[PDB]
Design a protein around this ligand. Sequence first.
Ligand SMILES: [Mg+2]
Ligand SMILES: [Mg+2]
Lengths: 239, 304
Amino acid sequence: SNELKVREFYRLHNACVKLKESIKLIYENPLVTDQNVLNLGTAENTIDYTILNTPTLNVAKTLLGNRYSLDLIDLFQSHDFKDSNTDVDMFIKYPVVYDENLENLAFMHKSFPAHLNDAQKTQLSNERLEFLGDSWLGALVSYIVYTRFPSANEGMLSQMKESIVNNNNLFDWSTKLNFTKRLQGNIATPKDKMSKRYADCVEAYIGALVIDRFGTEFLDIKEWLEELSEKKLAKSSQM
Amino acid sequence: SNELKVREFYRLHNACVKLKESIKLIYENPLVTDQNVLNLGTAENTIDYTILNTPTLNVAKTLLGNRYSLDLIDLFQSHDFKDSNTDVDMFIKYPVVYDENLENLAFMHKDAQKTQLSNERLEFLGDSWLGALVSYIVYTRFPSANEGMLSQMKESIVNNNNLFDWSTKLNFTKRLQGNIADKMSKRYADCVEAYIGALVIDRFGTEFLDIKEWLEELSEKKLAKPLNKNAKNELAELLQINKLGHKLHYRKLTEMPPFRVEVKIGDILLDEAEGNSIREAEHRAAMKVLENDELLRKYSVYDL
Ligand SMILES: [Mg+2]
Ligand SMILES: [Mg+2]
């Protein structure tokens, strides 16, 4: 309930961050502004007609033509909106999962081999999330080193990424994030096997964050990859 | 520039798709709807209070309050806006990279400028993101599969063999050709990954920004990045017999692992070194003196 309000706050704040980013792209797109710097209406086939009559241009032009009434960029500044810091941050340690169940699923230890069927066992183990979080930790970190070191070659980027995403470092993260006080249960813990399961949770948690945040930003790539993969994915034989 | 209009169009459309999605989240958020389902109260020292006074809630409420004038959801519906399809699609073959030079880079093979003239960094990025997107595809598509199954499905998609077939279907073969008419096969797979990398560069916005910034914060330390055993003895040759006639010795200050040792002649301090083991400090402390030409001239008997 208090947890719920904080969760819904970050859902809302992240939607505001995206709205702000997107309206700026819309207000400023060269196809939309009256200067027509790309010379729409100059093509000698129907391509310009097509572009001009899309829902996209219609919507964008209506938005741009409404700024006198409500200018969304000015709206955000008016209220000192900040993308990366909010007054609510003091109530959290790390980024928030919107869905409490998803978050809990992330800390649930995969038990090795009565009483539940295996389709609901997957809903009681962080192993799927770990699978996803592992992949996304890799992609985000690769993005970090790519943009952070524009001059580095692949060897450098790879070495740097590995020093970050390896299980040892992830155990240090789990320590930094107090994932220990998160795994306190009935049985005490008084390692090798240990460090690993902690690292799994760090990955699982990233998995949860991704599930909650995945929207439309990479949707066109996702849908494309999915269409290309369709024959392979239909071989869902090992299901 | 016919190319430019199309590139800018998909940049715009994707911004519109994101605006549509975001505005729906804002209009409908529990903290924002007038039915106050979560029950924000007016008590002063609470999260309720903190939330109610954020830039975020003020922006959200203003937006919701402006629907009567322009309802963004209505606006999209009234123009028949569609997220995944447009009439411009007839003019392209696969998702568009917004940045023409970035696209070209994706198709270039192999000092800091050399790095900017091959697709190897893009391939590095795209490999990662291809993996992430496919992992997301299988996870969501098969909610009852286990890690073992998800990995196997994903591997069957992201392996170099399959990527090679994609490059064929996408005609990346033609794009790689130039002046000069599984090795070559891997080069094609690399293009597919690099192109995915370029798509990602162009689209990466704020959707995963809070995660990204958090990871960078945790990562900062990882990102921000001798000894002479003939030292103690090479000192003795010079200083054991000295112009003071006093004893060259070493003195220990920290008896625990953070060891500190002073090199001295009688009461006179030559130098110090905080070594790990007593005998390494002594050597490094000597090292410092061995370099100090003025000290050696002052106390040494001979002349170098
Ligand atoms: Mg793992
Ligand atoms: Mg590769």
